[PDB]
Design a protein around this ligand. Structure first.
Ligand SMILES: O=c1c2cccnc2n(-c2cccc([N+](=O)[O-])c2)c(=O)n1Cc1ccncc1
Ligand SMILES: [Ca+2]
Ligand SMILES: [Mg+2]
Ligand SMILES: [Zn+2]
Length: 338
């Protein structure tokens, strides 16, 4: 019910560190550990690793100094105090995108500019998040909502901040891209981050299902994507899967994310209570069925998405999907009884 209402109102329209960074290609990287070892700089060290690993600095003539400055600055603009939508969630999504990009079924499909674009999109997609929803911002007549006219209010903001930070001294990581390259990347990045607006979930999902229904493959079984709308769609869904990936992670990672999000939600609901507003679903700490809420979230949102993605990249996502089902199974066993 409040699970039903949440859903309907959200998804509808130096040595140790290096050893841990060796898991950069693995689903279920200990991102919270990397955060601790890096002095709360997971996004920087993770992003830097991915860029060396994918050879992106040579390809795009990005000086490492420029990459590191930009990343440190970007990471600075994620909020200290926000429990979920912080630099660790950013790092997490980036590295999840990284792994999904490297999937066999997608081998040699995307250009380096597209790879660069999905990884950058990931890195910036929640920057300067205040730890409250679009609907909160809309209902409280906030300056951000006025500015962007009630539409993808936060996702427009993240975009604007992430590109704005390029303009600082020695931060222009796209300096050696051509004008054509730069426009192409800018377009792709905007399309992706705006696709992270949760309210678009069902729209995205419908499209992904059509991509699977109309799937064409080479004789070696690799995905054939011959138009821009098809390839940007695949990257939107990929980055959206990365964003709804927490339930698909090893359970000790999953439980931390769940705790952190609930604490961000309760933090909002406190604000709603101080303002005399009706507290949003899943935001009332005095009345929140967490276990049940996760079984619903998986059943109606996460598994549908991931099951379709798994179809698209068959069988590259099977272990991911097996973890998700096991996780669902755990939370189910934990549902409190009278
Ligand atoms: O990634 C997670 C998420 C990650 C871990 C745990 N739970 C999450 N939930 C969640 C939390 C409480 C209740 C429900 N529900 O469906 O009733 C879902 C979520 O909605 N998302 C996606 C999301 C993240 C941030 N804002 C809105 C939605
Ligand atoms: Ca960990
Ligand atoms: Mg977001
Ligand atoms: Zn996010």
């Amino acid at each position: 019910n409040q699970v039903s209402e949440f859903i309907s109102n959200t998804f509808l329209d130096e040595d140790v560190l290096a050893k841990e960074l060796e898991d950069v290609n693995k689903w279920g990287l200990h991102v919270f550990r990397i955060a601790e070892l890096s002095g709360n700089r997971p996004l920087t060290v993770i992003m830097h690793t991915i860029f060396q690993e994918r050879d992106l600095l040579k390809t795009f003539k990005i000086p490492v100094d420029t990459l590191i400055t930009y990343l440190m600055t970007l990471e600075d603009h994620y909020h200290a105090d926000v429990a979920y939508h912080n630099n660790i969630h950013a790092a997490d999504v980036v590295q999840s995108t990284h792994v999904l990009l490297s999937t066999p079924a997608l081998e040699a499909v995307f250009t380096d500019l597209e790879i660069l674009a999905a990884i950058f999109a990931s890195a910036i997609h929640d920057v300067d998040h205040p730890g409250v929803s679009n609907q909160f911002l809309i209902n409280t007549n906030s300056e951000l909502a006025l500015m962007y006219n009630d539409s993808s209010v936060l996702e427009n903001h993240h975009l604007a901040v992430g590109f704005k930070l390029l303009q600082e001294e020695n931060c222009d990581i796209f300096q050696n891209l051509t004008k054509k390259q730069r426009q192409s990347l800018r377009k792709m990045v905007i399309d992706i981050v705006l696709a992270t607006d949760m309210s678009k979930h069902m729209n995205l999902l419908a499209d992904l299902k059509t991509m699977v229904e109309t799937k064409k493959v080479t004789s070696s079984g690799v995905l054939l994507l011959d138009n821009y709308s098809d390839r940007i769609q695949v990257l939107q869904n990929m980055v959206h899967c990365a964003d709804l990936s927490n339930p698909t992670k090893p359970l000790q990672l999953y439980r931390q994310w769940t705790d952190r999000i609930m604490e961000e939600f309760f933090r909002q609901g406190d604000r709603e209570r101080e303002r005399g507003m009706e507290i949003s679903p899943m935001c009332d700490k005095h009345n929140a069925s967490v276990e049940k809420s996760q079984v619903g979230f998986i059943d109606y949102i996460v598994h549908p998405l991931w099951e379709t993605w798994a179809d698209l990249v068959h069988p590259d996502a099977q272990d991911i999907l097996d973890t998700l089902e096991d996780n669902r199974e755990w939370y189910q066993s934990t549902i409190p009884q009278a």
